[PDB]
Structure 1
């Protein structure tokens, strides 16, 4: 009973100012610059990046607990709604607890899947569930293993702050357990795709209280709570739900930049007969598949890393079976504002860059003048580069051998850089007054920058011959 006159328990709370749609918000990073496009030389290739702005906004209900085989949050715990909570390290409230009812979502129990907890508390709650669980085993004695509810999530990685909203997990976690090299994808060197195999066995639901005062014991006056920490910035919450099980986390990382990564990757995953593409096969060489299992009942720090995805597969699947006997650890939960008893949701909002790319393979041109006459060639193309605006800039370049007699069997190669475009070859036979007045023995326009563009002419002044193969 404070002099502030907000003495009644149900009064303090119900009369507590705040905005649910904020008190639990995680306004991400605030980026404001980059460059719409960029090419880059790295080995016998030409990299083309593109920088688009993206804004992934999400409002989660399903919050992931940090210390999987460890930290303990449960149906009843009362946690203030502050930033600590968001970082999976929520402050906690401990006052005298009046009885409550638990209920597990386990199958074939609708009607008898509910116990009471005379003294809401971890050990208490846990044990209860324990007894609850077993009781099931009893009703289902010829079954020791039942499938687990798998929830799939998946996405490439552009930022901690990005993958962190997409998959809905503390970014730190991934950065340690899966070991992410952000700055490598941030520079489009590495391309990462993370897998989210949330294994579910069941949950536990704490029956909603008609009123707050129905939780704390009468001896608990709202003012002790205003004291425990509550405020317009600490609206207490009750864990309305907890889901138990684990989570398989695969990481598909690579060094390529061939636009067909997410492609190859997905093809690989879904294991579609397209994954036998020679191109894919190459993108696969430069890729490492790491898969770990968090949550519980699984040798901590365990981990896999195979170039053969088949190995990642056995992992996942062999983690579907959910033993009813062995302990199931907490991995997800959903609290509720006492006051309005509405579901408490987090506000992840952030802008990030969407890297996009393609790779170009170098090539050279070989000329074969096994001709019974004299000829001059004219090879010209454009080298591409990108300005600060992300615009193409066509630098026109020509072979210094252009406009020059070449006799019975000549030989030369013309090294073209992987950023070569508008490639046109053209051999003109020298029967006439001058260049623009000779007959064309070959003239291919916009030739493709193949491994090798070989132009070979042959023939008689009168009866010329020519061809051009590609690799």
Structure 2
């Protein structure tokens, strides 16, 4: 069947079979080609003692590693022309990073199927004669506006909803979760990691995918079935394509609306998880519970990709206010605004097995416990000389991460005080083994002094008001707490 010349005529079926044979000949390790091991910086940690305004924070850096393995690649850019159903991509780091190298060579016609409800099967198949972002998007978009009349409006056609949340600890942890190209919208989300490190904030990052439709491609029978006979093995090699560097095709793309959302709070009340989770389902357990306390200390920045003139709104809508509105904007696919690429999956050209990306990393996990600042008030309205004895400890954490108690005591301890005396004392959140003893001189000689109050390890409440009064023989005392 060979040619006299010994050559393989470009544009002939022999060239396409040369290509076909070339791809089948390839041997590579799918898993090895698509694996990234992030920073494996896993060490040891210290307990830290930090003083914020209004509270004392003890910080426990534990150690964890997130590792995910999915075939679905999430879209960050708003009009990537490389990401069309059918596109050939090179398996590289470029692919591993949501910045793939397209292989635009002369492309054979492809048939797509799209999964819209209310579409006579026969009318869900689109033949595209020369696949490309322009021609594929052109074909489905024609179809949509046609489907838009005889169904789309006369029905509530609800978008597939997909929830996904994580607690930000670092950027590389978010990337393993959301995708290697998260940094883009990550840096737009204004995720202040510095303050999660120091225990001032708590950042959760949720992701909402709303899928209108998904356009797909069947298994390719023969690897060179995607090229016109004008493409030759030598063309493939000119462009770096080998078995060391094989190619995949985009086997489906899901179109719709996506929104990445950042819930930043200053409430280190470890029970934030439900405060955030609730708010997401629009439910309102009303003020003034702990939930409506947290959410008022909550800022929200959001990036929104989809269901609009093909760009992104980095909005910072303010407080927990605009979230029902965000999760509601474009919940129904109407076919008036055929949303953008939201996610896509690739299958190897050789054998059709879907490509799955293994990603991992170690991140510094920051658990935090907080001790609220308090006040201790004394009021002496009594007909006698009194003496206070007020003592406590200041808990610190030395370089080397251990527990140091540097004992303090009130300045005017042991002096005689007489009505009407009043002080207020700033006890910071780091104070332990609080002790207050109050004695009163009775004037009796057989009982000169008489202790009227004595408590060790006083709980550091927000406001405690110890008040002594009455006479030498009948003192009275109040110990009045408030929160």
TM-score w.r.t. structure 2 length?
0.85
The offset of 1:236, in angstroms, is 0.3
Aligned equivalent of 1:88: 98
Aligned equivalent of 1:360: 371
CA contact (8 A) 2:176 2:359 kept: yes
Determine the C-alpha separation between the residues in 2 that align with 1:291 and 1:364.
39
Does residue 55 (structure 1) correspond to residue 65 (structure 2)? The answer is: yes
Does residue 420 (structure 1) correspond to residue 420 (structure 2)? The answer is: no
Determine the C-alpha separation between the residues in 2 that align with 1:21 and 1:290.
36
Which of 186, 192, 195 is 1:175 aligned to?
A: 186
Q: Aligned Cα RMSD in Å?
A: 3.2
Aligned equivalent of 1:394: 405
CA contact (8 A) 1:428 1:438 kept: yes
1:316 match: secondary structure: coil
1:331 match: secondary structure: strand
The offset of 1:39, in angstroms, is 2.2
Does residue 103 (structure 1) correspond to residue 121 (structure 2)? The answer is: no
- Structure 2 portions without partners, runs of 5+: 1-5, 8-16
CA contact (8 A) 1:102 1:205 kept: yes
The offset of 1:302, in angstroms, is 3.1
Determine the C-alpha separation between the residues in 2 that align with 1:149 and 1:302.
21
* 1:105-163 deviation line (CA, Å, top 9, x unaligned): 11133632223333333333223323443453465265376221121112232222122
Does residue 129 (structure 1) correspond to residue 140 (structure 2)? The answer is: yes
Aligned pair in 2 of structure 1 residues 408, 142: CA closer, same or farther (>3 Å)?
closer
Determine the C-alpha separation between the residues in 1 that align with 2:387 and 2:455.
15
2:326 match: secondary structure: helix
* 1:427-447 deviation line (CA, Å, top 9, x unaligned): 245579999x96542222322
Determine the C-alpha separation between the residues in 1 that align with 2:327 and 2:180.
19
Alignment of 1:363-378 (within 5 A): 363-378=374-389
Which of 13, 27, 41 is 2:37 aligned to?
A: 27
Determine the C-alpha separation between the residues in 2 that align with 1:176 and 1:296.
22
How many residue pairs match? The answer is: 466
Aligned pair in 2 of structure 1 residues 86, 37: CA closer, same or farther (>3 Å)?
same
Single out whichever of 335-344 and 215-224 deviates more from structure 2: 215-224
Aligned pair in 2 of structure 1 residues 270, 78: CA closer, same or farther (>3 Å)?
same
2:279 match: secondary structure: helix
The offset of 1:392, in angstroms, is 3.0
Aligned equivalent of 1:302: 313
Aligned equivalent of 2:334: 323
* 1:441-469 deviation line (CA, Å, top 9, x unaligned): 22223222122222222344444422201
Determine the C-alpha separation between the residues in 2 that align with 1:138 and 1:283.
46
The offset of 1:386, in angstroms, is 1.6
Aligned pair in 2 of structure 1 residues 306, 243: CA closer, same or farther (>3 Å)?
closer
Does residue 208 (structure 1) correspond to residue 219 (structure 2)? The answer is: yes
The offset of 1:77, in angstroms, is 1.1
TM-score w.r.t. structure 1 length?
0.86
Which of 465, 468, 471 is 2:479 aligned to?
A: 468
Determine the C-alpha separation between the residues in 1 that align with 2:201 and 2:393.
29
